[PDB]
Amino acid sequence: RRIVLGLIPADGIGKEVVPAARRLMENLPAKHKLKFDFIDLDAGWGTFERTGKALPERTVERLKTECNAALFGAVQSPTHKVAGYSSPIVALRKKMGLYANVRPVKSLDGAKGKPVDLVIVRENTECLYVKEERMVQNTPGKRVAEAIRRISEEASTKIGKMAFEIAKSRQKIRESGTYSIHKKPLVTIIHKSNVMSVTDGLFRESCRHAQSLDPSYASINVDEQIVDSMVYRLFREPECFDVVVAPNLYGDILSDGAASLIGSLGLVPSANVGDNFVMSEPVHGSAPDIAGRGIANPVATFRSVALMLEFMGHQDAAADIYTAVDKVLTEGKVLTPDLGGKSGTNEITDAVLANIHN
Amino acid sequence: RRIVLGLIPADGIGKEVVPAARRLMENLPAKHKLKFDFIDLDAGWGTFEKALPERTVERLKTECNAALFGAVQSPTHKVAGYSSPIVALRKKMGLYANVRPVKSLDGAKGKPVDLVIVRENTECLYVKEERMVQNTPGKRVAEAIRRISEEASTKIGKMAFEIAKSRQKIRESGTYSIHKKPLVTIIHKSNVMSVTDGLFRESCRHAQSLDPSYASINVDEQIVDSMVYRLFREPECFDVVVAPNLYGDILSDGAASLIGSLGLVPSANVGDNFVMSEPVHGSAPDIAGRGIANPVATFRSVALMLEFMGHQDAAADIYTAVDKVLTEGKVLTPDLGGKSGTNEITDAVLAN
Ligand SMILES: NCC(=O)NCC(=O)NCC(=O)O
Ligand SMILES: NCC(=O)NCC(=O)NCC(=O)O
């Protein structure tokens, strides 16, 4: 089977980790029956500097017309507004219909402290990220600003459905015989209904109603958790969570909190998922302090590729990637500076490849 | 000095830890020169079964210099007539700052931390201004208003600097601290909320200029997401943290998770002429009335309240007395892995 994959390295260590991932993809075992054709695409801060547009329209056109999926590196986002610049990643997610931001956090077997195997499913189109704000009073010393938080039944139902689909997929993997810390599947709905009774009420009702949309979701357990005690429980008993579904802001904050459970950010994967497309993306940024020195950790990117392949229906390939990656990490011989080692990007790519062909 | 203290034990273990704290206050050693008058007030879930009687408010305004609140057994769903009494108390008494010290005991298991989350407690999304703007079956759309004002944000900013200054003075009096330098970290998400969070940031930065003695305090700015990430890994990097309402709520609960038992974590709601101490733990229905609740969070919230009332001496010796018991490890409640009751640990602190 053929996958046409858009490659969008963008900036800094994006330009090192995406070629690493291409090498991984090109060299998957024959048993997977998976070939890739790649298309190189331009986006990011460097694209903005050269052309005045962070996301060329041609890049979006090729994605929609040629590609089955994409891999995005990292954008060197400015720290203030720049005229003519807008985030190409936020733009690509909107333009490609990628409404779900999926962030799995899974500890290594034999890791210290509480084990974790959870997935945060973050609604990624609305809430406060509609960016609709006004300075309603401009009195010197007494300004008043207001922002709109918007929650819709349609978007919330869609994200709830995606959570149940993910829960169902994880449960099938368990039932196929792969060990899991969870004995029962669970979707935990995150909210703050005691303050946001109308908006979070809608979010909650919509996610609960999503369970009714397919008879195969009926077996999945559902509960609800207030956001603040969710952070409390995340740090102390993260083993209690399977699939967690949240509106945009709570999901953003919880995903970043959960990333802390597994050590270096160069280990943390993500995918942006829509109904007809998926874009993998490592959680780390462009790391300009180390860009060009051949020491970037490509593990987050590898796991992001594997996550993408999970959503595309290549469970076997994904599982072998995860196993090969974890073996490198547990063995602890080949480690990049962010892992406390002295090894380079290419050394760790070679190590993953050596394991996958074992 | 004489303090008139409203006692609002409200629900569950609130009914046990508040009497424990009353006793402590009655037994404050002569050298602190501090006596209390106590007034018993009614509020909470039991009080509803109205959550907050008007009498309670009237008495706070006109008789009390401070107050101590236990815990409300909050329901899991909405109830006609019922609105949170602790939320209404804070607004009525003008308690704009929610203050949560998270401080590990020297030698305790767990990650060293010594920070205070200073949470703006009046606005942001908590203005509770929502509307179902589209009501079409299947296609509903709801909206809420997040409001950030320069005046509220400057005020919480100023409070954060006051607390940073007061903590630096404690260090310089000879109390050991994991911090060599005072720091205010301003929390925001201005890459998403450019206008509202931009105003919060500007206002807190400007609050530094309100007292010349703050110029010496280091200031930085951190995105709420990174801050949650950093709390788990390197909480020792933070001193005073100032945040708008929602980010403050999430961070205070993230920070609290660092301490082994919630029975050790205090808080105070602070306004310009009033303070109300309040333990962080809930009403703990499933140990209530068994005489084993941990009163330490309550003692430390009393201690916190005393600091804000200008009794650093009293507060120090409560912290020292409480710290001493905890470090001996002889008289500990079950949540600390011990076998002692509420009254026995109160006795133990009283002994110091
Ligand atoms: N792949 C990580 C990355 O590019 N980070 C920079 C950025 O601006 N990300 C957008 C976001 O936080 O959603
Ligand atoms: N003392 C903590 C407490 O009462 N928790 C229950 C609760 O819902 N309190 C509301 C709040 O403190 O914000």
PDB file of all heavy atoms in Angstrom, chain A residues 133 143 145-147 149-151 153-154 192 197-199 236 252 263, chain B residues 130 139-140 142-144 146-148 150 189 195-196 225 233 259-260:
ATOM      1  N   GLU A 133     -11.499  39.351  20.619  1.00  0.00           N
ATOM      2  CA  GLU A 133     -11.284  40.211  21.771  1.00  0.00           C
ATOM      3  C   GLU A 133     -11.512  41.695  21.451  1.00  0.00           C
ATOM      4  O   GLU A 133     -11.357  42.114  20.294  1.00  0.00           O
ATOM      5  CB  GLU A 133      -9.848  40.066  22.261  1.00  0.00           C
ATOM      6  CG  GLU A 133      -9.356  38.676  22.492  1.00  0.00           C
ATOM      7  CD  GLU A 133      -7.981  38.706  23.152  1.00  0.00           C
ATOM      8  OE1 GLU A 133      -6.966  38.829  22.437  1.00  0.00           O
ATOM      9  OE2 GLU A 133      -7.926  38.681  24.396  1.00  0.00           O
ATOM     10  N   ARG A 143      -8.350  50.479  31.895  1.00  0.00           N
ATOM     11  CA  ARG A 143      -8.787  49.721  30.735  1.00  0.00           C
ATOM     12  C   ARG A 143      -9.551  48.434  31.122  1.00  0.00           C
ATOM     13  O   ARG A 143      -9.429  47.933  32.247  1.00  0.00           O
ATOM     14  CB  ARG A 143      -7.600  49.434  29.819  1.00  0.00           C
ATOM     15  CG  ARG A 143      -6.990  50.725  29.274  1.00  0.00           C
ATOM     16  CD  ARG A 143      -5.700  50.454  28.541  1.00  0.00           C
ATOM     17  NE  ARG A 143      -4.632  50.204  29.500  1.00  0.00           N
ATOM     18  CZ  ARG A 143      -3.490  49.595  29.204  1.00  0.00           C
ATOM     19  NH1 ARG A 143      -3.245  49.177  27.968  1.00  0.00           N
ATOM     20  NH2 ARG A 143      -2.593  49.411  30.159  1.00  0.00           N
ATOM     21  N   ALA A 145     -10.660  44.757  29.027  1.00  0.00           N
ATOM     22  CA  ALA A 145     -10.624  43.944  27.819  1.00  0.00           C
ATOM     23  C   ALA A 145     -11.555  42.764  27.993  1.00  0.00           C
ATOM     24  O   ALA A 145     -11.680  42.245  29.104  1.00  0.00           O
ATOM     25  CB  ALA A 145      -9.199  43.436  27.555  1.00  0.00           C
ATOM     26  N   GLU A 146     -12.178  42.315  26.899  1.00  0.00           N
ATOM     27  CA  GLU A 146     -13.045  41.139  26.927  1.00  0.00           C
ATOM     28  C   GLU A 146     -12.723  40.191  25.777  1.00  0.00           C
ATOM     29  O   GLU A 146     -12.424  40.646  24.661  1.00  0.00           O
ATOM     30  CB  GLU A 146     -14.529  41.551  26.877  1.00  0.00           C
ATOM     31  CG  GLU A 146     -15.011  42.282  28.130  1.00  0.00           C
ATOM     32  CD  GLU A 146     -16.485  42.658  28.087  1.00  0.00           C
ATOM     33  OE1 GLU A 146     -17.181  42.289  27.114  1.00  0.00           O
ATOM     34  OE2 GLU A 146     -16.935  43.328  29.041  1.00  0.00           O
ATOM     35  N   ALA A 147     -12.744  38.886  26.048  1.00  0.00           N
ATOM     36  CA  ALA A 147     -12.618  37.888  25.012  1.00  0.00           C
ATOM     37  C   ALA A 147     -13.828  36.982  25.022  1.00  0.00           C
ATOM     38  O   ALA A 147     -14.399  36.729  26.086  1.00  0.00           O
ATOM     39  CB  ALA A 147     -11.337  37.008  25.208  1.00  0.00           C
ATOM     40  N   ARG A 149     -15.322  33.213  24.595  1.00  0.00           N
ATOM     41  CA  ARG A 149     -15.099  31.757  24.631  1.00  0.00           C
ATOM     42  C   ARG A 149     -16.331  31.122  23.957  1.00  0.00           C
ATOM     43  O   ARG A 149     -17.450  31.265  24.461  1.00  0.00           O
ATOM     44  CB  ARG A 149     -15.009  31.274  26.089  1.00  0.00           C
ATOM     45  CG  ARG A 149     -14.833  29.756  26.244  1.00  0.00           C
ATOM     46  CD  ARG A 149     -14.767  29.311  27.713  1.00  0.00           C
ATOM     47  NE  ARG A 149     -14.202  27.975  27.809  1.00  0.00           N
ATOM     48  CZ  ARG A 149     -14.873  26.875  28.162  1.00  0.00           C
ATOM     49  NH1 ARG A 149     -16.164  26.942  28.507  1.00  0.00           N
ATOM     50  NH2 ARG A 149     -14.243  25.694  28.174  1.00  0.00           N
ATOM     51  N   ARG A 150     -16.140  30.445  22.828  1.00  0.00           N
ATOM     52  CA  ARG A 150     -17.276  29.865  22.098  1.00  0.00           C
ATOM     53  C   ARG A 150     -17.204  28.340  22.094  1.00  0.00           C
ATOM     54  O   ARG A 150     -16.194  27.742  21.720  1.00  0.00           O
ATOM     55  CB  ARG A 150     -17.294  30.382  20.647  1.00  0.00           C
ATOM     56  CG  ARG A 150     -18.496  29.822  19.803  1.00  0.00           C
ATOM     57  CD  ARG A 150     -18.641  30.557  18.434  1.00  0.00           C
ATOM     58  NE  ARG A 150     -18.820  32.005  18.588  1.00  0.00           N
ATOM     59  CZ  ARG A 150     -17.963  32.932  18.159  1.00  0.00           C
ATOM     60  NH1 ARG A 150     -16.865  32.574  17.482  1.00  0.00           N
ATOM     61  NH2 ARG A 150     -18.226  34.220  18.354  1.00  0.00           N
ATOM     62  N   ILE A 151     -18.301  27.703  22.466  1.00  0.00           N
ATOM     63  CA  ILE A 151     -18.361  26.245  22.482  1.00  0.00           C
ATOM     64  C   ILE A 151     -19.579  25.878  21.637  1.00  0.00           C
ATOM     65  O   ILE A 151     -20.684  26.389  21.881  1.00  0.00           O
ATOM     66  CB  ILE A 151     -18.497  25.695  23.944  1.00  0.00           C
ATOM     67  CG1 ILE A 151     -17.224  26.006  24.758  1.00  0.00           C
ATOM     68  CG2 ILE A 151     -18.867  24.157  23.951  1.00  0.00           C
ATOM     69  CD1 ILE A 151     -15.948  25.440  24.127  1.00  0.00           C
ATOM     70  N   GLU A 153     -22.113  22.813  19.815  1.00  0.00           N
ATOM     71  CA  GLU A 153     -22.569  21.431  19.878  1.00  0.00           C
ATOM     72  C   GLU A 153     -21.908  20.584  18.795  1.00  0.00           C
ATOM     73  O   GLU A 153     -21.496  19.445  19.051  1.00  0.00           O
ATOM     74  CB  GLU A 153     -24.087  21.386  19.707  1.00  0.00           C
ATOM     75  CG  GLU A 153     -24.686  20.053  20.117  1.00  0.00           C
ATOM     76  CD  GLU A 153     -26.162  20.161  20.316  1.00  0.00           C
ATOM     77  OE1 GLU A 153     -26.749  21.172  19.852  1.00  0.00           O
ATOM     78  OE2 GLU A 153     -26.728  19.244  20.932  1.00  0.00           O
ATOM     79  N   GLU A 154     -21.812  21.128  17.578  1.00  0.00           N
ATOM     80  CA  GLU A 154     -21.209  20.350  16.494  1.00  0.00           C
ATOM     81  C   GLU A 154     -19.737  20.002  16.773  1.00  0.00           C
ATOM     82  O   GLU A 154     -19.332  18.844  16.605  1.00  0.00           O
ATOM     83  CB  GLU A 154     -21.368  21.058  15.141  1.00  0.00           C
ATOM     84  CG  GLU A 154     -22.801  20.964  14.619  1.00  0.00           C
ATOM     85  CD  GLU A 154     -22.933  21.359  13.139  1.00  0.00           C
ATOM     86  OE1 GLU A 154     -22.293  22.331  12.704  1.00  0.00           O
ATOM     87  OE2 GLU A 154     -23.701  20.689  12.422  1.00  0.00           O
ATOM     88  N   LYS A 192     -15.378  22.510  33.533  1.00  0.00           N
ATOM     89  CA  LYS A 192     -15.480  23.323  34.742  1.00  0.00           C
ATOM     90  C   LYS A 192     -16.904  23.902  34.800  1.00  0.00           C
ATOM     91  O   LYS A 192     -17.098  25.132  34.857  1.00  0.00           O
ATOM     92  CB  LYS A 192     -14.412  24.412  34.700  1.00  0.00           C
ATOM     93  CG  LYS A 192     -14.122  25.087  36.012  1.00  0.00           C
ATOM     94  CD  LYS A 192     -12.919  25.995  35.830  1.00  0.00           C
ATOM     95  CE  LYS A 192     -12.451  26.499  37.159  1.00  0.00           C
ATOM     96  NZ  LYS A 192     -11.988  25.401  38.017  1.00  0.00           N
ATOM     97  N   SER A 197     -21.332  27.096  33.496  1.00  0.00           N
ATOM     98  CA  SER A 197     -22.484  26.174  33.397  1.00  0.00           C
ATOM     99  C   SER A 197     -23.066  26.013  31.999  1.00  0.00           C
ATOM    100  O   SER A 197     -23.519  24.925  31.648  1.00  0.00           O
ATOM    101  CB  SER A 197     -23.590  26.504  34.402  1.00  0.00           C
ATOM    102  OG  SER A 197     -24.048  27.830  34.238  1.00  0.00           O
ATOM    103  N   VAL A 198     -23.057  27.084  31.209  1.00  0.00           N
ATOM    104  CA  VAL A 198     -23.657  27.030  29.863  1.00  0.00           C
ATOM    105  C   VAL A 198     -22.692  26.437  28.831  1.00  0.00           C
ATOM    106  O   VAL A 198     -23.021  25.434  28.199  1.00  0.00           O
ATOM    107  CB  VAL A 198     -24.212  28.388  29.422  1.00  0.00           C
ATOM    108  CG1 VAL A 198     -24.797  28.303  27.985  1.00  0.00           C
ATOM    109  CG2 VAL A 198     -25.270  28.872  30.411  1.00  0.00           C
ATOM    110  N   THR A 199     -21.501  27.035  28.694  1.00  0.00           N
ATOM    111  CA  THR A 199     -20.484  26.569  27.727  1.00  0.00           C
ATOM    112  C   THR A 199     -19.945  25.176  28.038  1.00  0.00           C
ATOM    113  O   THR A 199     -19.916  24.295  27.161  1.00  0.00           O
ATOM    114  CB  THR A 199     -19.332  27.585  27.538  1.00  0.00           C
ATOM    115  OG1 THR A 199     -18.801  27.991  28.824  1.00  0.00           O
ATOM    116  CG2 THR A 199     -19.826  28.853  26.695  1.00  0.00           C
ATOM    117  N   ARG A 236      -0.241  12.830  40.441  1.00  0.00           N
ATOM    118  CA  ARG A 236      -0.168  11.851  41.504  1.00  0.00           C
ATOM    119  C   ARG A 236      -0.573  10.451  41.100  1.00  0.00           C
ATOM    120  O   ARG A 236       0.011   9.468  41.587  1.00  0.00           O
ATOM    121  CB  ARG A 236      -1.049  12.300  42.666  1.00  0.00           C
ATOM    122  CG  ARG A 236      -0.548  13.610  43.253  1.00  0.00           C
ATOM    123  CD  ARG A 236      -1.625  14.229  44.079  1.00  0.00           C
ATOM    124  NE  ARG A 236      -1.843  13.464  45.310  1.00  0.00           N
ATOM    125  CZ  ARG A 236      -1.191  13.644  46.450  1.00  0.00           C
ATOM    126  NH1 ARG A 236      -0.230  14.567  46.566  1.00  0.00           N
ATOM    127  NH2 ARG A 236      -1.500  12.887  47.491  1.00  0.00           N
ATOM    128  N   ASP A 252      -5.078  21.977  25.998  1.00  0.00           N
ATOM    129  CA  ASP A 252      -3.756  22.583  25.809  1.00  0.00           C
ATOM    130  C   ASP A 252      -2.966  22.556  27.105  1.00  0.00           C
ATOM    131  O   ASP A 252      -1.812  22.086  27.128  1.00  0.00           O
ATOM    132  CB  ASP A 252      -3.927  24.002  25.228  1.00  0.00           C
ATOM    133  CG  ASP A 252      -2.651  24.572  24.628  1.00  0.00           C
ATOM    134  OD1 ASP A 252      -1.611  23.868  24.633  1.00  0.00           O
ATOM    135  OD2 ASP A 252      -2.694  25.741  24.165  1.00  0.00           O
ATOM    136  N   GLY A 263       9.734  12.914  30.871  1.00  0.00           N
ATOM    137  CA  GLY A 263      11.135  13.345  30.716  1.00  0.00           C
ATOM    138  C   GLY A 263      11.253  14.351  29.583  1.00  0.00           C
ATOM    139  O   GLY A 263      10.432  15.239  29.441  1.00  0.00           O
TER     140      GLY A 263
ATOM    141  N   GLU B 130     -22.653  34.179  30.405  1.00  0.00           N
ATOM    142  CA  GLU B 130     -22.824  33.238  29.280  1.00  0.00           C
ATOM    143  C   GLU B 130     -24.164  33.376  28.577  1.00  0.00           C
ATOM    144  O   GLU B 130     -25.140  33.762  29.200  1.00  0.00           O
ATOM    145  CB  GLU B 130     -22.753  31.822  29.804  1.00  0.00           C
ATOM    146  CG  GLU B 130     -21.550  31.572  30.681  1.00  0.00           C
ATOM    147  CD  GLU B 130     -21.373  30.096  30.943  1.00  0.00           C
ATOM    148  OE1 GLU B 130     -21.997  29.578  31.906  1.00  0.00           O
ATOM    149  OE2 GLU B 130     -20.658  29.462  30.145  1.00  0.00           O
ATOM    150  N   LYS B 139     -27.302  21.883  16.788  1.00  0.00           N
ATOM    151  CA  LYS B 139     -26.362  22.898  16.301  1.00  0.00           C
ATOM    152  C   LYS B 139     -26.283  24.100  17.240  1.00  0.00           C
ATOM    153  O   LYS B 139     -25.987  25.219  16.831  1.00  0.00           O
ATOM    154  CB  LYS B 139     -26.720  23.316  14.857  1.00  0.00           C
ATOM    155  CG  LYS B 139     -26.706  22.158  13.836  1.00  0.00           C
ATOM    156  CD  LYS B 139     -27.490  22.534  12.550  1.00  0.00           C
ATOM    157  CE  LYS B 139     -27.530  21.402  11.535  1.00  0.00           C
ATOM    158  NZ  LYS B 139     -26.135  21.073  11.090  1.00  0.00           N
ATOM    159  N   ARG B 140     -26.456  23.837  18.524  1.00  0.00           N
ATOM    160  CA  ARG B 140     -26.312  24.878  19.517  1.00  0.00           C
ATOM    161  C   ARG B 140     -24.939  25.495  19.578  1.00  0.00           C
ATOM    162  O   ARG B 140     -23.914  24.826  19.362  1.00  0.00           O
ATOM    163  CB  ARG B 140     -26.741  24.371  20.879  1.00  0.00           C
ATOM    164  CG  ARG B 140     -28.256  24.161  20.937  1.00  0.00           C
ATOM    165  CD  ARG B 140     -28.642  23.551  22.262  1.00  0.00           C
ATOM    166  NE  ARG B 140     -28.125  22.186  22.388  1.00  0.00           N
ATOM    167  CZ  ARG B 140     -28.028  21.525  23.544  1.00  0.00           C
ATOM    168  NH1 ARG B 140     -28.422  22.104  24.678  1.00  0.00           N
ATOM    169  NH2 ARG B 140     -27.537  20.286  23.566  1.00  0.00           N
ATOM    170  N   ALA B 142     -22.864  28.116  22.296  1.00  0.00           N
ATOM    171  CA  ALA B 142     -22.828  28.903  23.534  1.00  0.00           C
ATOM    172  C   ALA B 142     -21.599  29.814  23.583  1.00  0.00           C
ATOM    173  O   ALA B 142     -20.524  29.491  23.032  1.00  0.00           O
ATOM    174  CB  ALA B 142     -22.910  27.974  24.773  1.00  0.00           C
ATOM    175  N   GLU B 143     -21.750  30.989  24.189  1.00  0.00           N
ATOM    176  CA  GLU B 143     -20.599  31.885  24.362  1.00  0.00           C
ATOM    177  C   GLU B 143     -20.439  32.353  25.811  1.00  0.00           C
ATOM    178  O   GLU B 143     -21.434  32.592  26.486  1.00  0.00           O
ATOM    179  CB  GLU B 143     -20.715  33.108  23.464  1.00  0.00           C
ATOM    180  CG  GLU B 143     -20.663  32.799  21.939  1.00  0.00           C
ATOM    181  CD  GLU B 143     -20.759  34.041  21.040  1.00  0.00           C
ATOM    182  OE1 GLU B 143     -21.010  35.158  21.530  1.00  0.00           O
ATOM    183  OE2 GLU B 143     -20.538  33.889  19.829  1.00  0.00           O
ATOM    184  N   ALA B 144     -19.202  32.520  26.264  1.00  0.00           N
ATOM    185  CA  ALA B 144     -18.943  33.135  27.576  1.00  0.00           C
ATOM    186  C   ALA B 144     -17.973  34.293  27.441  1.00  0.00           C
ATOM    187  O   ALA B 144     -17.110  34.272  26.566  1.00  0.00           O
ATOM    188  CB  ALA B 144     -18.369  32.120  28.546  1.00  0.00           C
ATOM    189  N   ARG B 146     -14.818  36.359  28.889  1.00  0.00           N
ATOM    190  CA  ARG B 146     -13.615  36.474  29.744  1.00  0.00           C
ATOM    191  C   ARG B 146     -13.251  37.951  29.887  1.00  0.00           C
ATOM    192  O   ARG B 146     -12.906  38.602  28.890  1.00  0.00           O
ATOM    193  CB  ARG B 146     -12.448  35.715  29.102  1.00  0.00           C
ATOM    194  CG  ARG B 146     -11.088  35.858  29.808  1.00  0.00           C
ATOM    195  CD  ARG B 146     -10.042  34.962  29.099  1.00  0.00           C
ATOM    196  NE  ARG B 146      -8.936  34.616  29.976  1.00  0.00           N
ATOM    197  CZ  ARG B 146      -7.763  35.261  30.011  1.00  0.00           C
ATOM    198  NH1 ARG B 146      -7.499  36.264  29.187  1.00  0.00           N
ATOM    199  NH2 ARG B 146      -6.821  34.885  30.873  1.00  0.00           N
ATOM    200  N   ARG B 147     -13.349  38.494  31.098  1.00  0.00           N
ATOM    201  CA  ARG B 147     -13.092  39.906  31.320  1.00  0.00           C
ATOM    202  C   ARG B 147     -11.826  40.142  32.150  1.00  0.00           C
ATOM    203  O   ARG B 147     -11.689  39.614  33.253  1.00  0.00           O
ATOM    204  CB  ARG B 147     -14.304  40.569  32.004  1.00  0.00           C
ATOM    205  CG  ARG B 147     -14.114  42.082  32.211  1.00  0.00           C
ATOM    206  CD  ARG B 147     -15.357  42.785  32.766  1.00  0.00           C
ATOM    207  NE  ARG B 147     -16.469  42.671  31.825  1.00  0.00           N
ATOM    208  CZ  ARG B 147     -17.594  42.007  32.082  1.00  0.00           C
ATOM    209  NH1 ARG B 147     -17.773  41.428  33.266  1.00  0.00           N
ATOM    210  NH2 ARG B 147     -18.537  41.933  31.159  1.00  0.00           N
ATOM    211  N   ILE B 148     -10.898  40.935  31.615  1.00  0.00           N
ATOM    212  CA  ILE B 148      -9.678  41.306  32.348  1.00  0.00           C
ATOM    213  C   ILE B 148      -9.642  42.823  32.415  1.00  0.00           C
ATOM    214  O   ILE B 148      -9.764  43.490  31.389  1.00  0.00           O
ATOM    215  CB  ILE B 148      -8.368  40.749  31.666  1.00  0.00           C
ATOM    216  CG1 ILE B 148      -8.392  39.216  31.593  1.00  0.00           C
ATOM    217  CG2 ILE B 148      -7.090  41.288  32.375  1.00  0.00           C
ATOM    218  CD1 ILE B 148      -8.363  38.503  32.928  1.00  0.00           C
ATOM    219  N   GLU B 150      -7.677  46.409  33.933  1.00  0.00           N
ATOM    220  CA  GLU B 150      -6.433  46.982  34.441  1.00  0.00           C
ATOM    221  C   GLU B 150      -6.432  47.160  35.956  1.00  0.00           C
ATOM    222  O   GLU B 150      -5.414  46.923  36.613  1.00  0.00           O
ATOM    223  CB  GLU B 150      -6.171  48.335  33.782  1.00  0.00           C
ATOM    224  CG  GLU B 150      -4.743  48.867  33.924  1.00  0.00           C
ATOM    225  CD  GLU B 150      -4.442  49.961  32.916  1.00  0.00           C
ATOM    226  OE1 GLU B 150      -5.391  50.461  32.273  1.00  0.00           O
ATOM    227  OE2 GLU B 150      -3.259  50.328  32.750  1.00  0.00           O
ATOM    228  N   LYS B 189      -1.135  33.748  28.651  1.00  0.00           N
ATOM    229  CA  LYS B 189      -1.136  32.993  27.413  1.00  0.00           C
ATOM    230  C   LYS B 189      -1.362  34.030  26.304  1.00  0.00           C
ATOM    231  O   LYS B 189      -2.342  33.941  25.552  1.00  0.00           O
ATOM    232  CB  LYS B 189      -2.273  31.977  27.452  1.00  0.00           C
ATOM    233  CG  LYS B 189      -2.102  30.782  26.559  1.00  0.00           C
ATOM    234  CD  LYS B 189      -3.067  29.662  26.959  1.00  0.00           C
ATOM    235  CE  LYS B 189      -3.029  28.563  25.920  1.00  0.00           C
ATOM    236  NZ  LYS B 189      -1.711  27.884  25.771  1.00  0.00           N
ATOM    237  N   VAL B 195      -4.984  40.477  23.606  1.00  0.00           N
ATOM    238  CA  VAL B 195      -5.563  41.668  24.245  1.00  0.00           C
ATOM    239  C   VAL B 195      -5.754  41.496  25.760  1.00  0.00           C
ATOM    240  O   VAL B 195      -5.263  42.314  26.564  1.00  0.00           O
ATOM    241  CB  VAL B 195      -6.879  42.118  23.551  1.00  0.00           C
ATOM    242  CG1 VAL B 195      -7.483  43.389  24.217  1.00  0.00           C
ATOM    243  CG2 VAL B 195      -6.629  42.360  22.046  1.00  0.00           C
ATOM    244  N   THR B 196      -6.475  40.444  26.145  1.00  0.00           N
ATOM    245  CA  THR B 196      -6.843  40.281  27.556  1.00  0.00           C
ATOM    246  C   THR B 196      -5.589  39.925  28.365  1.00  0.00           C
ATOM    247  O   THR B 196      -5.338  40.548  29.385  1.00  0.00           O
ATOM    248  CB  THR B 196      -7.965  39.221  27.786  1.00  0.00           C
ATOM    249  OG1 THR B 196      -7.678  38.043  27.041  1.00  0.00           O
ATOM    250  CG2 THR B 196      -9.375  39.752  27.350  1.00  0.00           C
ATOM    251  N   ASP B 225       1.005  27.051  30.257  1.00  0.00           N
ATOM    252  CA  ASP B 225       1.305  25.669  29.851  1.00  0.00           C
ATOM    253  C   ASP B 225       2.709  25.217  30.266  1.00  0.00           C
ATOM    254  O   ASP B 225       2.892  24.103  30.741  1.00  0.00           O
ATOM    255  CB  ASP B 225       1.158  25.526  28.327  1.00  0.00           C
ATOM    256  CG  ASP B 225      -0.225  25.956  27.824  1.00  0.00           C
ATOM    257  OD1 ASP B 225      -0.649  27.103  28.090  1.00  0.00           O
ATOM    258  OD2 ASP B 225      -0.893  25.145  27.169  1.00  0.00           O
ATOM    259  N   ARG B 233       8.472  19.305  37.351  1.00  0.00           N
ATOM    260  CA  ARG B 233       9.879  18.946  37.172  1.00  0.00           C
ATOM    261  C   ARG B 233      10.835  19.759  38.009  1.00  0.00           C
ATOM    262  O   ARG B 233      11.799  19.243  38.529  1.00  0.00           O
ATOM    263  CB  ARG B 233      10.261  19.136  35.708  1.00  0.00           C
ATOM    264  CG  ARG B 233       9.413  18.291  34.801  1.00  0.00           C
ATOM    265  CD  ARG B 233       9.596  18.749  33.384  1.00  0.00           C
ATOM    266  NE  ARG B 233      10.874  18.343  32.857  1.00  0.00           N
ATOM    267  CZ  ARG B 233      11.067  17.189  32.241  1.00  0.00           C
ATOM    268  NH1 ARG B 233      10.048  16.342  32.087  1.00  0.00           N
ATOM    269  NH2 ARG B 233      12.271  16.878  31.800  1.00  0.00           N
ATOM    270  N   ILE B 259       2.757  18.224  47.414  1.00  0.00           N
ATOM    271  CA  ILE B 259       2.764  17.904  48.861  1.00  0.00           C
ATOM    272  C   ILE B 259       2.028  16.580  49.109  1.00  0.00           C
ATOM    273  O   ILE B 259       0.965  16.349  48.562  1.00  0.00           O
ATOM    274  CB  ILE B 259       2.102  19.033  49.660  1.00  0.00           C
ATOM    275  CG1 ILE B 259       2.652  20.391  49.242  1.00  0.00           C
ATOM    276  CG2 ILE B 259       2.174  18.772  51.207  1.00  0.00           C
ATOM    277  CD1 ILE B 259       4.169  20.592  49.445  1.00  0.00           C
ATOM    278  N   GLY B 260       2.596  15.705  49.937  1.00  0.00           N
ATOM    279  CA  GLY B 260       2.056  14.349  50.081  1.00  0.00           C
ATOM    280  C   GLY B 260       0.588  14.235  50.482  1.00  0.00           C
ATOM    281  O   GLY B 260      -0.137  13.364  49.983  1.00  0.00           O
TER     282      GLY B 260
END
